[PDB]
Amino acid sequence: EDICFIAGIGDTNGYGWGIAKELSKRNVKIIFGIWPPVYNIFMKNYKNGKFDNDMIIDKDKKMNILDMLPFDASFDTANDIDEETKNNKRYNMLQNYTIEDVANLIHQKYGKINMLVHSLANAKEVQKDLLNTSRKGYLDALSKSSYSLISLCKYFVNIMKPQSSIISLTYHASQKVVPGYGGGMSSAKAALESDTRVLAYHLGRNYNIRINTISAGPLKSRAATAITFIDYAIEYSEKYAPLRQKLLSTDIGSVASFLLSRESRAITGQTIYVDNGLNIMFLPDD
Amino acid sequence: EDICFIAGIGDTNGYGWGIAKELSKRNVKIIFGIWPPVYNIFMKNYKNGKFDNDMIIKMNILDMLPFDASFDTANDIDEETKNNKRYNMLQNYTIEDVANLIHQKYGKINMLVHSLANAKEVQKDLLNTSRKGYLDALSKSSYSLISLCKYFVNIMKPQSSIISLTYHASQKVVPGYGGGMSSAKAALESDTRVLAYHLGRNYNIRINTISAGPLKSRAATAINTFIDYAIEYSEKYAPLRQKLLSTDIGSVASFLLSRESRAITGQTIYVDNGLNIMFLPDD
Amino acid sequence: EDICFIAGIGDTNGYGWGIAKELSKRNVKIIFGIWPPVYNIFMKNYKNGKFDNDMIIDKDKKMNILDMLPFDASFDTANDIDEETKNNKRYNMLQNYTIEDVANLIHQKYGKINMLVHSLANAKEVQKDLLNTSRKGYLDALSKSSYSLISLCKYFVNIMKPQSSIISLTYHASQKVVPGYGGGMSSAKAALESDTRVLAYHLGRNYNIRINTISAGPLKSRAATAITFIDYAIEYSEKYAPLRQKLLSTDIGSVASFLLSRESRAITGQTIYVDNGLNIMFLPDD
Amino acid sequence: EDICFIAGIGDTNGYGWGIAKELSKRNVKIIFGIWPPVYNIFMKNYKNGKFDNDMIIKMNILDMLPFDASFDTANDIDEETKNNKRYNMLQNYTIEDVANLIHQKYGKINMLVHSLANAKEVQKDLLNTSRKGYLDALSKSSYSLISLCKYFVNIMKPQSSIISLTYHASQKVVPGYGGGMSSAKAALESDTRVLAYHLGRNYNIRINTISAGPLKSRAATAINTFIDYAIEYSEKYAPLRQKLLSTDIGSVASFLLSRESRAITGQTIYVDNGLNIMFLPDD
Numbered sequence A, C: 001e002d003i004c005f006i007a008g009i010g011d012t013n014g015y016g017w018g019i020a021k022e023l024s025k026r027n028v029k030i031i032f033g034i035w036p037p038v039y040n041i042f043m044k045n046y047k048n049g050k051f052d053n054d055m056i057i058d059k060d061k062k063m064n065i066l067d068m069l070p071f072d073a074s075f076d077t078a079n080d081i082d083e084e085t086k087n088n089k090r091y092n093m094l095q096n097y098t099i100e101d102v103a104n105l106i107h108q109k110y111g112k113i114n115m116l117v118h119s120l121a122n123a124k125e126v127q128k129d130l131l132n133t134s135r136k137g138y139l140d141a142l143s144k145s146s147y148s149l150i151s152l153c154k155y156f157v158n159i160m161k162p163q164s165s166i167i168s169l170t171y172h173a174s175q176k177v178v179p180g181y182g183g184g185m186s187s188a189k190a191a192l193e194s195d196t197r198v199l200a201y202h203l204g205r206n207y208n209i210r211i212n213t214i215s216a217g218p219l220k221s222r223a224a225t226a227i228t229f230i231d232y233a234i235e236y237s238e239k240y241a242p243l244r245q246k247l248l249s250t251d252i253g254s255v256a257s258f259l260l261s262r263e264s265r266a267i268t269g270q271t272i273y274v275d276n277g278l279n280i281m282f283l284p285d286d
Numbered sequence B, D: 001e002d003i004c005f006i007a008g009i010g011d012t013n014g015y016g017w018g019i020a021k022e023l024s025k026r027n028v029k030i031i032f033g034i035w036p037p038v039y040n041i042f043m044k045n046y047k048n049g050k051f052d053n054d055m056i057i058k059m060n061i062l063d064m065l066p067f068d069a070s071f072d073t074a075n076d077i078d079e080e081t082k083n084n085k086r087y088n089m090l091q092n093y094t095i096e097d098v099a100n101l102i103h104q105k106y107g108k109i110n111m112l113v114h115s116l117a118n119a120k121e122v123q124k125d126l127l128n129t130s131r132k133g134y135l136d137a138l139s140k141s142s143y144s145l146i147s148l149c150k151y152f153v154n155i156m157k158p159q160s161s162i163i164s165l166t167y168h169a170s171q172k173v174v175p176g177y178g179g180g181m182s183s184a185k186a187a188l189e190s191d192t193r194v195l196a197y198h199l200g201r202n203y204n205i206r207i208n209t210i211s212a213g214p215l216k217s218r219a220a221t222a223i224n225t226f227i228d229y230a231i232e233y234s235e236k237y238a239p240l241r242q243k244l245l246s247t248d249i250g251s252v253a254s255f256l257l258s259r260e261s262r263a264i265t266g267q268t269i270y271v272d273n274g275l276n277i278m279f280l281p282d283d
Ligand SMILES: NC(=O)c1ccc[n+]([C@@H]2O[C@H](COP(=O)([O-])OP(=O)(O)OC[C@H]3O[C@@H](n4cnc5c(N)ncnc54)[C@H](O)[C@@H]3O)[C@@H](O)[C@H]2O)c1
Pocket: A007, A008, A009, A010, A011, A013, A014, A015, A016, A034, A035, A038, A071, A072, A073, A074, A118, A119, A120, A121, A122, A144, A169, A170, A171, A215, A216, A217, A218, A219, A220, A221, A222, A223, A224
């Protein structure tokens, strides 16, 4: 009986869903953490049957969704909730959605878990290049995309079993430049990859828990489209990557499933590339 | 059905055996390519049942073939080795010949493990290594991967997968990892990228390398017991303090060889309890 | 006539001073940016002759200090000055010390400059390991140590000549784990090294200006001592680095001087290690 | 006074010449080691004054010596090359002999440049490279650095400095950089670390490598005009859009060889207008 918390699903078109689907093949029970502004729309669509085909694994298997909870990675505890958000129409009907509140809820309802997925990012100035990003904009990217991972580990470690495992998602813009990946998103991914190492040291030594990050190639997710640098990145990857196949969210999903299992017990602190090999190339091969 | 060729098993104390065990768990059929210096004894020990405890999960060894990755084709075999005591009776042990042999008996296969290394002057530091010694390390430990690819690629299906084993001394200095071995592993990790480009584009085949932590194998023990220090250091300082097992590398190998890793290629994946991530002893 | 702005000197015991000294050999005119809480003590010591021996370059040369200005890397513009700090006894007697204010002052007094040094870091929670660092603590480290570099470039680019050059200082904890380098300092250095690349792209393409970072080995600076992980790091480096010599601030200084000159015109976006080789080692060589 | 040996100049269109020019600016005395296939023509062109325009900053060429980094000692020279048309008249061109020669004429020196590479099968992709071709690339382009170190180290002062040149195809795939050249540069960058450990500890000598961007040298032009594409791509996409000059590498070389870089060792330093930092064309 394995339980995974996946923080960062808003629809069926991102990596978090692909990860949920692949874990389900292994009979892992899934809890979704859903950003409060899209929580109700998600629930409506789910209730309305919009995701029913998206949920099919096998001839014999539906995805087993244990729960779906509102989850906001910008707040650590109840003390951090600011009053404008406390009053926002979308947040008003929701409760216990800070990082600590959701660990407590999960623990109270289901007991201890053994897999944790961070699958989320935000950067209010993602559309500006780094040089024109404000302090507020930069720190928001770091806060939502990088620090949220450390906070998640801090609060969830207490409700996890020994030999538990943690993954996050990153992008290669942290290491090589991608013009257009703005707003301090590149900086936040670099911090996330570095933090994955430091966290692996503390979590390995103090709890025997492992943490890794998957550097994913491009996927036409809601976040990607909102940034169409994405249609370009996808076309580029499909022309130039060693592997010509379309990169699927379930390609990242099956890697995540492995990293989250005991089959990878001797892997920790690593950035694992799942991108059809594209990261290895220097120049276009024209 | 999955068929894997493992080049580089001589006993049950190395990474090749741990990889065999884990692949057998997943019901993949295993063919061993065994270096002629140890071929007769491995066979004998197996027949005489000494590996019975070691095969307990039981393993499905399809075939056990003499194999010497120094030789690309039968024409490369020098007269001396051809006439040598351990080679004289044996046939079809070159890279081209074992590939041809395997294809003839079993058809196309889908998994290839390179799990071997050799270097005449491993006990000399790099600065004191001869041209002959350095090139011997590159020939046996790096070029052997390229040639294995070249020949096995024609008897492998699309979507097949290749792994080798490497060591972090390619990237950070390990005094004692001598004879051009550090150089050979740096070349192997770089070649893993270039191969991944050619194999992916032309054959839809994947190739990755596992950077393993220390294990007290036959090879490791022979190198003038830095190995027991290496192990002790890893168990004291790695983020993860469990004993590193051969089957720990084996389960990551199984993953990389399987269709679960279809979007991973050209990568060096560290299976080392995280030791590689540390800068300074945390004393 | 070359002018360099060095932001981050508090005394003669850090890297900024070593950099100032080596630039002075090349007859570059130096402006110091000095954190306001230590500005007056610095000035007093300077006036009192405390640094006179520290200032000697040659038999023939004193260091040419063009000006010394209060400079606070936590504030971008006059609008950002918060009222508690506006009232702090040390800030009360000082003005025009935000990043934009000091670029304007330098420009007004001396015209355009051609070298810029970022030599500063802070992290209010540096003493906590990463897992126990708060959001506030983490974002403070990123704000003062990482974002300050982007802000400096944004405001100083307008007062720089073409073919100008920029360096910052980093540490290898960004890339490999150093227990004790807490507070999100590791994360901030990782962001700084990544940002150095992204900035090099924008600054190279839009202004023909270069930017690099020096990854320095350990030096017994005020900041290092305040963290004695430092006495240990220094002893370790001196036993285990390829090069056995004591690492001097002027060893980093002479590298900085080169990176800031036209002799390195084809180098940009790089992390250059100046650490006696220590970064290349895997295990102690006992 | 500073004395530098530059191994790998055959003309004025390569990195070796650009390095010579910049070192001469700093009044270092330059000795050239010139490969015998081009030795007579280089000498002739120099004597006949064709390099007069090229030497304008004027340069201080101390000596010009035939040198073949394939040979560690006189005993390594095969009878065929010893008797060959271009080698037959020449003496003292092995690594040990040029070191001995230099020491005898000039005493100890303080600077060494490795600026050479060679590979029989550079035009073949890696997968199609023979064992002989791959090992030839490693021998000439990587091992030559180790051996140069071994011998020059005894005729170098403490605090001396060594550089080689490398290319980013060691780290990221460049289709067309064939024949084991990518492998050779990965080995050279790794060996630069191991050497830095041994040389630093035992001799207080530094060693670093420069990863240069593209330059239309004789060597580059011979490889079946990817070079003109490489250059055009670099000038369109690098953060810095200036033409990359030979003397741009030369001024970084001068820095690394000088006491200004005394705390830098084991490093691969990119001098490439920043091209290496990019992931995707910014189109
Ligand atoms: N799509 C790609 O091409 C790609 C490539 C590499 C890495 N990634 C990474 O994968 C991860 C998932 O993104 P995706 O592309 O699947 O897009 P997505 O739009 O499916 O998921 C991003 C999720 O983050 C959530 N989120 C935003 N702010 C939040 C907050 N304050 N608190 C809690 N949740 C919040 C959003 O609701 C959204 O569901 C991200 O870390 C992203 O950086 C994506």
